[PDB]
């Protein structure tokens, strides 16, 4: 029961994949006319309070 809710949610949601819209956007329209190129994120063991050079 410590994690019971999490397990129930996973069993209820990771199953929800066969929905055709599930891999599809909730909104097939841009906020307005613009260009949205790919944006990534870099992860590291490197944090603040480290650099002054």
């Amino acid at each position: 029961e410590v994690h019971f809710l999490s397990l129930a949610t996973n069993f209820l949601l990771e199953m929800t994949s066969m929905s055709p819209d599930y891999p599809n956007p909730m909104f097939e329209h841009p906020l307005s006319e613009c260009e949205f190129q790919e944006y990534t994120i870099d992860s590291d063991w490197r944090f603040r309070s480290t650099v002054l050079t």
Partner: protein
């Protein structure tokens, strides 16, 4: 009836019958493809461009025997225009007054008025209140900038200058009266004084048409003023 019709056609001979038929019959209304709709299924959502059916259905909806068939067509067209009007919102529209649907307005609106002013009062009773609702929508302050222009201009030229369909002319005149009245009600004086869509633009149009040499223009302007008079006498 059809038998006698084809009998006539053959009687007239080819040299006459060819008068049945240059813009060359089509322009492919939208330069783009839009009016999309994903048909739902338990496994997939195939997308459908509803727009492709508009030129056909309209001709079916506007012109058809088979009261059953025509009624089905007009009901389905009402549904599609409802859907498209709803799709008008939530659109990125920074390139035109109504990029995702501007030409479709031009195509539909005359057909909408004809379908709202025609015989078989079932269509009348399902369209005239609908077009009134359309007026109340495209008279909004948000709906007051370059797309209301299309409906306004059409609702002008439709019957106010039209050889035929007297009831169409009268209906479009009453539509104009209702539209201006609703604009007065809903809209602040600020927009009416700023936006060219106002009583003075209408006055200029009417003066032009009455001056313009044609029975149809002048008669439409006269009757339209007659319609608007009932409320305009109440404006100081």
């Amino acid at each position: 009836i059809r038998i006698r019709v084809v009998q006539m056609l053959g009687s007239l001979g080819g040299q006459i019958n060819k008068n049945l038929l240059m813009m060359k019959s089509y322009v492919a209304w939208d330069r783009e493809k839009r009016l999309s709709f994903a048909v739902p299924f338990r496994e997939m959502k195939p997308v459908i461009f509803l727009d492709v059916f508009l030129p056909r259905v309209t001709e079916l909806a506007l012109t058809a025997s088979d009261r059953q068939t025509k009624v089905a067509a007009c009901e389905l067209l009402h549904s599609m225009v409802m859907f498209m009007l709803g799709k008008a919102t939530q659109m990125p529209e920074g390139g035109q007054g109504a990029p995702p649907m501007y030409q479709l307005y031009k195509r539909t609106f005359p057909v909408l008025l004809r379908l709202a002013c025609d015989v078989d009062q079932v269509t009348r009773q399902l369209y005239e209140p609908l077009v009134m609702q359309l007026i109340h929508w495209f008279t909004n302050n948000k709906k007051f900038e370059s797309q209301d222009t299309v409906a306004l201009l059409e609702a002008i030229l439709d019957g106010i200058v039209d050889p035929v369909d007297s009831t169409l002319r009268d209906f479009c005149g009453r539509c104009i009266r209702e539209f201006l009245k609703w604009s007065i009600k809903q809209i602040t004086p600020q927009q009416q004084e700023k936006s060219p869509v106002n009583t003075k633009s209408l006055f200029k149009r009417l003066y032009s048409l009455a001056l313009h040499p044609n029975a149809f223009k002048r008669l439409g302007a006269s009757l339209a003023f007659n319609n608007i008079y009932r409320e305009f006498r109440e404006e100081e």
